[PDB]
Write a protein that binds this ligand. Structure first.
Ligand SMILES: [Cl-]
Ligand SMILES: [Cl-]
Ligand SMILES: [Cl-]
Ligand SMILES: [Cl-]
Lengths: 317, 337, 334, 337, 334, 317
């Protein structure tokens, strides 16, 4: 009995995660809960076996050198998994996070015109944020899909790794997977500025160079999508400007305030699982606001007739 | 004659610590006093022997590289210990702190709903602080236990070394011992952000980046547990923000003010003894107090926070009239009277 | 069937770009749209073959070492292309951007006296801005050409990389391509200050360095053209001053306010019945506006331009020109 | 046919510049126009030949390393030139700026006592500024000449490349050409501080450290000469202080305010043509103006500084009614009227 | 005649230092004065010989590589010396500082109950300060000894390098020498917080790090002694708080004001009729003074001490004791 | 005819500097003036010869590598010279600055009790500053001499290079010449803190480490002398604090304000050549002043009865 059977089983169960922990049977997180599969506990040896069985030298070298490591792993028919191996008090430990295979519709998600409208801006920056778990990628996928269905454009994405896979419809879609198709977000980004892209998607925004660059893309005339694990328009902004050395905030705050087209912060809630969105749209007033970002909320609250909304506001809905 | 026999003997003696020091016989601390066991003095060779005999490569490598190291060590039937080896003028030296094996639950510790409520927050930051001796951990352990008993979640802790060992009950509990299971708090923390944890216990605030990281964990949607040596909500906050370079306080003070779910500062008093807790709970008002710098006016905030179940330490103290006494109480009050 | 035939075909089609993407037939961007050529999809092997067939060792070495690379490639009778090879989920990928071959004229673009007048200022700063797409380079080129045809001066350009290539007519034209002819904008700029230039072209101006220097060039008595991607005189200004550390804005705002000769922001629009035509916002240096700059009251710039009538609001220009089509590019729709 | 014949021919033509550009025949700038000489176009090979033929290793090494380089070059009977080699789209490129061989003295330039007085200060900073074309150097040269004729001092200059060449008269004159005699302004400057110089001419303000250093030279007790492209005392100051990181302006503004002995901003006007000077002299009042940030109120300071011999540029302009004209004058006035 | 005979002779003379300097006879510092021994001058060769004769390869290798080096050296019956070899204009040079052999008592130093009382606080911070010369170490040692003789506790010391060596009496005494037993004050300090120490001795406290940590030790419930070179309670405080970045003083001033148990500044004076006696300024923790600290009103500290009478002003202490001799060490002469 | 004869001749002439410059006869600066010796001009070859003749490989290697170099050079009976070689438009160039051989008396210099008093402080910092040329070293030498004559102490000096040489009188005097006896000011300084020194002299204060260290010496209980090329007590202070990163001024300003015992700024004037001193003495008031250093002057002006004096004040004298 090997890790594929297990992984396969996770998927068939709708599991978002598979957890291996020396000393316990495999468990899966489903609808947020983490629960044992009806199988015998896995002793250290076993889990460690299971793990090594799907790593290569490098990975095996790290894991042993640094006691923990990350890599992705694919189950051909089933799905791809993000995989983190680590050691704990009882022995080996690995968690598998299943990656959304299918890129779902906008209607399928019940998203409205507001989204299209945002997706339609000719250029500038759009940030779709949300606590790691709120399915950012999907909203994104859907918005991307929407353009791929309506514009004869060139969507260039940079993912670490690639999440959904899109089919080139009206758009040339080129997805580059960090570490396989490209050396990193910054390298890839630079190239992008000369790959004739219309729309650029940047998965993770780990280092400043990625931000820095991403901004120049928005500034030089493209439409760019990136994501932060901020949970609020206001926080999102702060987050972006605040990670820069004092001596450089101005230039960033300035840039952003000019290219920021909209910010969407998302989050999942248990359905009588449905997504709540805070929506903030670019607006001459808000532009300015971008050091008085404090007075952003009430701005969004009165932004209704453009389609904006407080998260709480959305909630009550 | 090996270190187990010794360790076992400590326990049988109710020793809180066993001390090995090249040049002296083993000694144990009991009821606070440190006293030689009726054995011959241990020469350097011996203690260093005794020590390596229970270490592994890594540990041996550190000790050798950094002249000192920590790790935990278990005596199967007897108890677990917290082991620090170091060198001193006379030769090798090692101190063993026995780790509480048996867990007290909130019940066993007489902790009330307030605690559960706190433990129950979906995400954010919770700091359980207190001097050493104060018993912060037990409280912690009890809180963690409480969720492990009631939620199907994933508790991930990052201790140095591991405090109490938990049995996965309703929770997947993964405890990682720094230096053995992981290279350090920061490395471990990062991984955590992608190990699908619900609750993260950060052992100590090993350094700025540990804080930095710990905060982003609270921010991105995990309940995070951490601890300080601060003895007051107010001080605890200050302590957190103040250890950052001026150029960066804002972003920290801002963060904290958003993710701080509650602060509990504890301390032991001679009953046995019994724990006094200052309890401060997250609250739109207090939030500001933090965001803004007006942390000064926090105290009266807590004093009127009664109905969320908050409490001044002193406030708590007076209660303990009901075990405790005044004499001592005065000795720990913030404002004796 | 090889990449030349394709490239050739792009040009014949007026394509601005040729795109190769393993898994899809070749596509070209024309009038801003990207569309498949009526050819069979190119499998990984093929595109990768096509690519390598035109690269040399170095290029092939990089591409393989760094998974992506750039280089230029020429089709003798047809045109030169700036070529980026990269890898994507489906296999190889390469995009060919055709480079303007002809250094093309001011009449041909229907630009008026206003432009000449601007081009004619003896010294100072001229910024031609606009975001990728609006081919200002084209207008710039035309303006430069204009002088190259009328003044016995020395035009010295610093481009990364050289866009249009000019032939020395009445002017000595020296174009330096960053990274080939020079180490960088700043290095090049300094030299320029002692290369006896009349007119200096600074390709892009995205950096404190380049800006700083560009300004001193304008200040020491030269005519300097620079460019941006801002879409508005007002924004352009803000953009320049705002990218400097607080402690230094004054000196920049001050400088600019003295050397700024004119700002032109451009943009392309779908010509009613095929094609596309450029709309220009034009703002000219003027004692009043100078202040507006030196002081911080750039806000009240708009109305200044509106009463500056050869100046013009972009919207103003628009109306001049498919209705809803444009009102779609207004700063105030209607 | 070699570069000398050409250079010689330039001079005979009154050319201010000779231009070599791979792909075109040699051209010269005369009366501001640039025009081809009646010779066949020069292919890359040729111009690159011509060039190396007059460079030495170092120069050749730079050109090769940094794709461009500067140096001076002399035609014995004819004149000295300022040589920059660079590459352009068509191939090699080089521009020769002829250096004024003959010196005009204050007399020949009609400069008055004000200048001598300034040149005579025992130590401190003197900035002679002006756009290119303005003739700042000549003035400079003349000032330097003046002391070289009257003091038994040691003038040390650090040009890139060397402007005018001086003959040691009453002064030991040591001119160091950056890239040939010295690695750079900063390296050279440091040495200067221990070469027993009285007067130091710094060519250009190559960079922050050049400024930094130049200032300490003024501060430690040397007369220092420097130049900017600024066209006004007020701007000159701003320019100096403003190019420093915020965190450091104070120390610069402070320094300057103490060592600034005088600022002269110059400019040429169509007579021939004739030079207009704005003159600003060090003065306890103005000092403050600098130390404090109130440089704004400098202008009126100069306007009442008449008796030390200070003068607004405009002020100076109107004088030139006596050659010059209004039409033009308006064109350079700070406030046309 | 070798360096042992000399060293031995120093000790017999009560010398604190032996100095070798090529070109001069050996000299010793006694009672603060440095004076030649009645011996012939030592030529370069000699001192250099004398030196090398007691060094080993490593030491000889450094000395030659880095022109100077340190190491310790012991005279079996007599004492250990901390030894620095260096080169000077005349040739070799070496200075021998004798290290206190005996961990010497509180009576022997005529220190009173005040000291015991201080030493007896269960936890908090105690600072014994004074500049090089005033051998506080001595008082410190005596205080530590006092507890080592009366409490069954664990004294853990962190010294660079270990000064007096204590024998474990009622206390477990662990002394760690920075650079030999530990990598640094901070590393060592951290470990300490989990070595079950009762009393912690931090040799010197000259660094944000060491201070920071030292404080947390006092804060988490320990008794920590640290030292300085300040010569006054008031100055001592200032000195601690003032070496921190503005943005962090509060937290430090706050901490200190809570853990500061007492400050002792010391100094030596020439005992009327030979020798020397120590004068101590004594300042004790006190609710009032606490505030004075937490608040910034440290100024009004003096009068606080003056009315704190076991506390004492230094001057106050002085009068207690050759007249003009002292009035020479007053904060207010007379 | 070689460079020794010349150098010798300089000394016999009271020259402060000998200048060699390809294209001109040798010249010497005397009483501030620089004048040709009655000798034929030195062609490039010659001066370059003369120079190489007294350099060694290293020096010759630098000079050629870096087009300029420094080193010292001694004329056995005569004096030691600081020597800077450089290249100029005409060829080689070298300047020789003669170093004060003799360390002169305090009386010989007509310096008063103020100086003794300063020299007598048991510890702390004393800065003798003055434009490179004002003979700082001498005032210093004299003060040092004064203690060497009156205290049984250990004077340790660190010079680059050694200027005057002192004879151990009542003091153990140990002079260490940077680059010969020690690797640098910082290395040497550190050692000093454990060489049982009473008084420490630090010639140059090039880098912060030297300052930093020098201060800790003053702070830990020694008397330290150092020099800056500042010309004023007020400037001197500023100079010291201002060269430190913002994040560290406090600690420096704080330290200094506690250890600063006195500042003396000097300068030479043409005698009907006599030294003018500005004298500033440590003082509870001034201590505080050390950010209000601005209000320092008037403090010194009223400091008379302690012995302080404005430079100008001194001048009129
Ligand atoms: Cl505890
Ligand atoms: Cl374009
Ligand atoms: Cl000029
Ligand atoms: Cl001592």
């Amino acid at each position: 009995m090997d890790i594929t059977e297990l992984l396969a089983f996770s998927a068939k169960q709708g599991a978002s995660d598979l957890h291996l922990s020396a000393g316990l049977p495999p468990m899966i997180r489903v609808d947020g809960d983490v629960r044992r599969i009806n199988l015998p506990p896995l002793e250290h040896k076993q889990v460690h076996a299971l793990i090594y069985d799907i790593m290569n030298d490098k990975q095996r070298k790290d894991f042993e050198e640094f006691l923990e490591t990350d890599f992705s792993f694919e189950v051909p028919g089933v799905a791809r998994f993000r995989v983190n191996a680590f050691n704990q008090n009882r022995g080996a430990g690995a968690v598998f996070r299943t990656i959304p295979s299918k890129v779902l519709t906008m209607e399928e998600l019940g998203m409205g015109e507001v989204f299209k409208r945002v997706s339609d801006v000719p250029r500038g920056l759009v940030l779709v944020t949300g606590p790691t778990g709120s399915g950012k990628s999907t909203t994104l996928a859907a918005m991307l899909d929407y353009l791929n269905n309506t514009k004869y454009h060139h969507i260039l994405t940079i993912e670490d790794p690639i999440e959904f896979v899109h089919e080139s419809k009206k758009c040339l879609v080129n997805q580059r997977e960090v570490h396989r198709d490209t050396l990193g977000f910054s390298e890839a980004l630079r190239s992008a500025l000369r790959e004739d892209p219309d729309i650029i998607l940047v998965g993770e925004m780990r280092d400043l160079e990625t931000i820095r660059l991403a901004l120049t893309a928005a500034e030089t005339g493209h439409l760019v999508f990136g994501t932060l694990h901020t949970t609020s328009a206001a926080k999102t902004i702060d987050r972006v400007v605040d990670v820069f050395p004092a001596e450089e905030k101005a230039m960033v705050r300035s840039m952003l305030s000019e290219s920021l087209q909209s910010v969407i912060s998302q989050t999942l809630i248990k359905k009588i699982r449905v997504a709540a969105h805070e929506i903030m749209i670019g607006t001459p007033a808000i532009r300015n606001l971008i050091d008085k970002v404090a007075q952003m909320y009430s701005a969004i609250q009165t932004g209704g007739s453009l389609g904006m909304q407080t998260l709480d506001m959305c909630l009550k809905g």
